[PDB]
Design a protein around this ligand. Structure first.
Ligand SMILES: Cc1ncc(C[n+]2csc(CCOP(=O)(O)OP(=O)(O)O)c2C)c(N)n1
Ligand SMILES: Cc1ncc(C[n+]2csc(CCOP(=O)(O)OP(=O)(O)O)c2C)c(N)n1
Ligand SMILES: [Cl-]
Ligand SMILES: [Cl-]
Ligand SMILES: [K+]
Ligand SMILES: [K+]
Ligand SMILES: [K+]
Ligand SMILES: [K+]
Ligand SMILES: [Mn+2]
Ligand SMILES: [Mn+2]
Lengths: 329, 369, 329, 369
């Protein structure tokens, strides 16, 4: 398919995407807290020595300023790849993201834009990260017309989705599931390649029920597909949404039209989580095919706890039990 | 002392460092209230034609303000922010810039556009949101932008342009084509956290940018006694390692000299400069007038003739603006993203259908196609 | 019912609530940009002369600092009523609101709290406010466990809901529909009274369809109820949600169980708007009663335009046409 | 000059104001590296018992750090932030405070809790998230809080406590019971916009608060050359109208004198003070040791005995912490709001049912009830 490959874990596939970007786009710079020495998750290792201290550099410890600065770079046409050290700390930049980056092109009649901006950030739980090293903020951004939000599930998906976000002409947030940074490696092409934005991927076909998730939770619903087939002889269609907005409404409705049943799952809290947007849309377009209520299996409506994490997350057992009931509705 | 955070000696006596507020950073002035040059060695000796351009831009801006302000009071436009007291800061600083220097600002920077020859019809088109607005009628009045004149579209949220301006200056440094960025804001906006972000990034990343703070003693109702307790905003520059100066914003020559010199050094040295121009919420226009008179470059007759011609240029542009249609409602949906997502086209299509059936209930008469 | 009343418009009913609070709670202070002289919508007129310059005061122009400062007051047990001048400018405080105020009690095991905090802010469209004087940010806050979000529809509802938010022991955002500040007046009691939080109100009973909205859009769906009865002989049940979170799931399901059909409406953009949360929940609890898809009639997924406002908002005609189709599904 | 924003004279010469960075605010020192008092007129002559309490709190904190740090390396706890180099700033400043002064901080302030006698078993309970944690096991390790000791629960997002601390100081002013607030943060956290918000509000609202900035030259990997370009953080105080001083954070006596005097004036005058304590990423403990020796207040034997006793107190608390159960999972749902919303109870109930059926798959063995 894509030429010579190499075993990479997710952090490695990130550095590969960033290295390929800097190599072919002379305007591109990478900046944020502690990126110069390689970053706290090693995602920028070797890149400042390779490309120069004016292209891969540390900013002061100020998130609103990191995003505002990145927008200013992108206004001149240069590629700005900003990092926010944990997705949990993206909120001081919420006004720059939502009132500024997202609206820049619209409000100017396309006289100005920040489409060459990408903000990449570690995301999702990690076993022990508690309130502020665990968050999945995607739904906060989903209500904001003008940004793209993208979340991969593996090293190969990560490099190709990050390359698309970097090259896309709209401000993008790329959320990197941090618990996968050093998990299992898979083969990833050395040279650049793209995976399309706003396109979900059906990774397993099935006929009885549709499962949708993103990031690490995709591996959760893959295991639930196995459990269900094994324990209930139920055929699950398993879908990785990938892009949160704009999202692939088409691929998800087509599937629900075939199976008649949907379970959506994410680590973020239930209330106002993105599963409600997919749920309500699917219900509107597929109403006459629904055999049972669309289920949402999500984190509880609480902050993300340290010691109680094992009981908080929407794990395979929570999902399997929800699927079971849905089958018997 | 061996501490990496600071270069300093020890002291063996406890002494708290006190702000000097009562006797602050002095105010640089070139010409007095009578238009007299106070210290000939500071005179910029701008040539007559340029100085008249300054005068005429200041006064034409004031004529347009008068008309559009009254238009707001009558409800023909929904919003207006005037430039009274700000004509000198804006025309005098713009004149010290290269034409291609990128400008960021907010509500009192129309003077910069005027000096750069932005057509009156376009200031008008934006205020009326008519078909001629390249902003497509999407933003509130006075939210001007011009890509040709290197003037970044204004947004309402205060201080957001400040760290953006620093980014554009960083990018200019890298591109190596000798350009500066200027960023205007008021003393109230300087209290937002984005000002502290911008100031700090500009110094640590070594960016060729001029921060231009206009201090008029008020942010809406809030006097400065309630906005800060240091010696204005200029006193804050040195704390970020930024070279700073304070000037008389009623003196176009003083604004010009400080801006010119800031631009020269920012560009050469890749370092930020802070100019705080003091103004009132004696007036830049009359002060320059007294200067024109003393050089023999202006007089009553010329002044009355120019007042009449500028009034008519403004009213020609005004009447034409008021009479143009607004853009096609289709344009509410474009430029959200560069491309239009299919689900957004689907909403465009739903409005089209809606107006097919219910259009008699919408003001379709005023909008194009 | 509530003693002597007086004709008040919404701004007046706000000042009445604030005056009553300061009169009976000696700890209470009101602060924000330009509140001392009465505020840009006249909501604090007369209160500094009456109660003192240490109790009703201007801060610097810094929203993150306004909310952070308010949280610190409330940590000592004192009532802090902060104002953000337009809801559009609440975003610089998003991190204080979401990472701090909302989580303060949880993360400390209830050793500390900011429950005596209320943030009140002008909200919703105004005819000509364009991108940054028009926004309805409620859905951004709805995904945040630990805050309450409340939105009244009239002067009488406003005073009683604001009094509850002020007195409730959890951090509250009260959004004041600014287009009603000087609209029609209604009788409002002079003395304090409370309307409960997390309780929707059925303002008109009906049998064929349920309509839900909040703020100014409640008057929109009341007119749609009239239109429908007149033009289609359709009986609408009209419901004002009032509290965005925690929301009155019970009152809304009871109604949909009776009517079998639901249309939800809000000025905020469709995607990730709060109507998707109500939609997906109602579908889960009332699935077997749904005669037709739950409809959402919302603003388009764009920033809020100046000149195109008449074509953007989910007005009575948009809603009526959606209801029509739903009746004929 | 008649401008409301600033009190100042005119100047008739263009002169930009330059930062003095090479020769910065000097560093206040009381005792040299040998524990010798340098200038007797600055000696606080703290009584022996208090000074020994300082020494013992610093060293016991260091013993606990050693143990918990190794515990993190072995994976028995998930996170740890030590106090090495910070023992002097924290014990010396806490000692200058009243016991009821409210403390806000972040990751290097356990010294303050130690001086205020927070039980070792509670530092431990929080790190292990066990039944004895009044924080109910909800936050990452080292996120200490104590309502009894007036120590506001730490949160991970940097600088957020700074404007909160200013609010609590405003509220204290109004209550009129002579209390100060102290707010600790690092030089990296001082770059966030919330620091500029806090500093400014403290001065304009006239709040009795001490800002205590610990400057160790680094924020994770980022040296200060990349964090700011002014003369550290102290140089920024005067710009907000805040009285500022810089001290040797290796000298408990110097930290104590500046803190004591800041507290006295903040409380009396309702004004903020800024202390920047310089530290290393020569050491506060050994320096105080040399002082104890020269007064005849300590010796090798006492030092070995105390090292042994403190090690055993720490290990007693450690072993007990490790052996306690974690709290009931029911506690993940409470305190979200003060009351528990019905829809949240419904989720609590769904977990209970879930664990009835699938509990064998959860670590239920370690959690209470
Ligand atoms: C983030 C944000 N908060 C509040 C406002 C409301 N506002 C519009 S102008 C203004 C005063 C700004 O004062 P200053 O910056 O001094 O400019 P000046 O009007 O004196 O020229 C305020 C508070 C805003 N536009 N943006
Ligand atoms: C808002 C936010 N951004 C980033 C971080 C990650 N972070 C944790 S400690 C730290 C360095 C803080 O440095 P400084 O304030 O100097 O304290 P020090 O560690 O030197 O004591 C960083 C960047 C954070 N916790 N919060
Ligand atoms: Cl505004
Ligand atoms: Cl952290
Ligand atoms: K991009
Ligand atoms: K702006
Ligand atoms: K409250
Ligand atoms: K904090
Ligand atoms: Mn001002
Ligand atoms: Mn540091």
């Amino acid at each position: 398919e894509y030429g010579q490959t190499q075993k990479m874990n997710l952090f490695q596939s990130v550095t590969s995407a960033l290295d390929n970007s800097l190599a072919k786009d002379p305007t591109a710079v990478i900046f944020g807290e502690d990126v110069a020495f390689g970053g706290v998750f090693r995602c920028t290792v070797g890149l400042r020595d390779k490309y120069g201290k004016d292209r891969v550099f540390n900013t002061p410890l100020c998130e609103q300023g990191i995003v505002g600065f990145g927008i200013g770079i992108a206004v001149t046409g240069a590629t700005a790849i900003a990092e926010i050290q944990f997705a949990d700390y993206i909120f001081p930049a919420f006004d720059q993201i939502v009132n500024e980056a997202a609206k820049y092109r619209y409000r100017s009649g396309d006289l100005f834009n920040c489409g060459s901006l990408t903000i990449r950030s570690p995301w999702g739980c990690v076993g022990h990260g508690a309130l502020y090293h665990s968050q999945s903020p995607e739904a906060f951004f989903a209500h904001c017309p003008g940004i793209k939000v993208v979340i991969p599930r593996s090293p190969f998906q990560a490099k190709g989705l990050l390359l698309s976000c970097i090259e896309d002409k709209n401000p993008c947030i790329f959320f990197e599931p941090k618990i996968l940074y050093r998990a299992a490696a898979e083969e990833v092409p050395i040279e650049p390649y793209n995976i399309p934005l706003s396109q979900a991927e059906v990774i397993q076909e099935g006929s009885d029920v549709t499962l949708v998730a993103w990031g690490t939770q995709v591996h959760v619903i893959r295991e639930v597909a196995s459990m269900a087939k094994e324990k209930l002889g139920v055929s699950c269609e398993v879908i990785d949404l990938r892009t949160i907005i704009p999202w692939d409404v088409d691929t998800i409705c087509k599937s629900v039209i075939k199976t008649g049943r949907l379970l959506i799952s994410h680590e973020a809290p239930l209330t106002g989580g993105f599963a409600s947007e997919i749920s309500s849309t699917v219900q509107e377009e597929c109403f006459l095919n629904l055999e049972a209520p669309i289920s949402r299996v999500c984190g509880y409506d609480t902050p993300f706890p340290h010691i109680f994490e094992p009981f908080y997350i929407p794990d395979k057992w929570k999902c399997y039990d929800a699927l079971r009931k849905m089958i018997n509705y | 002392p061996q501490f990496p955070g600071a270069s300093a000696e020890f002291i063996d006596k406890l002494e708290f460092i006190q702000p000097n507020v009562i006797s602050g950073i002095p105010i640089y002035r070139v010409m007095d209230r009578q238009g007299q040059i106070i210290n000939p060695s500071e005179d910029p000796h701008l040539p007559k034609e340029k100085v008249l351009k300054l005068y005429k831009s200041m006064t034409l801006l004031n004529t347009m303000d008068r008309i559009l302000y009254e238009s707001q009071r009558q409800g023909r436009i929904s919003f207006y922010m005037t430039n009274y007291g700000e004509e000198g800061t804006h025309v005098g600083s713009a004149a010290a810039l290269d034409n291609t220097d990128l400008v960021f600002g907010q509500y009192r920077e129309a003077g910069v556009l005027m000096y750069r020859d932005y057509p009156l019809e376009l200031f008008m088109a934006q205020c009326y949101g008519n078909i001629s607005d390249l902003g497509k009628g999407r933003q509130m009045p006075v939210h001007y932008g011009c890509k040709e004149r290197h003037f970044v579209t204004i947004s309402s949220p205060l201080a957001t342009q400040i760290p953006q301006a620093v980014g554009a200056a960083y990018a200019a440094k890298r591109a190596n084509a000798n350009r500066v960025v200027i960023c205007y804001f008021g003393e109230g906006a300087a209290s937002e956290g984005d000002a502290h972000a911008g100031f700090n990034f500009a110094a640590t990343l070594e960016c060729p940018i001029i921060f231009f703070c206009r201090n008029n003693g008020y942010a809406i109702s809030t006097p400065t006694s309630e906005q800060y307790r240091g010696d204005g905003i200029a006193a804050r520059g040195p704390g970020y390692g930024i070279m700073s100066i304070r000037v008389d914003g009623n003196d176009v020559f003083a604004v010009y000299n400080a801006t010119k010199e800031a631009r020269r050094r920012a560009v050469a040295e890749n370092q930020p400069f802070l100019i705080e121009a003091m103004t009132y919420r004696d007036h830049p226009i009359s002060r320059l007038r007294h200067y024109l008179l003393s050089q023999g470059w202006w007089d009553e007759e010329q002044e009355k003739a120019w007042r009449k011609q500028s009034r008519r240029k403004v009213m020609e542009a005004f009447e034409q603006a008021e009479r143009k249609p607004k853009p096609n409602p289709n344009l509410l949906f474009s430029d959200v993203y560069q491309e239009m997502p299919a689900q957004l086209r689907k909403q465009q299509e739903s409005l089209a259908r809606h107006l097919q059936t219910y259009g008699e209930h919408y003001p379709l008469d005023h909008f194009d196609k």
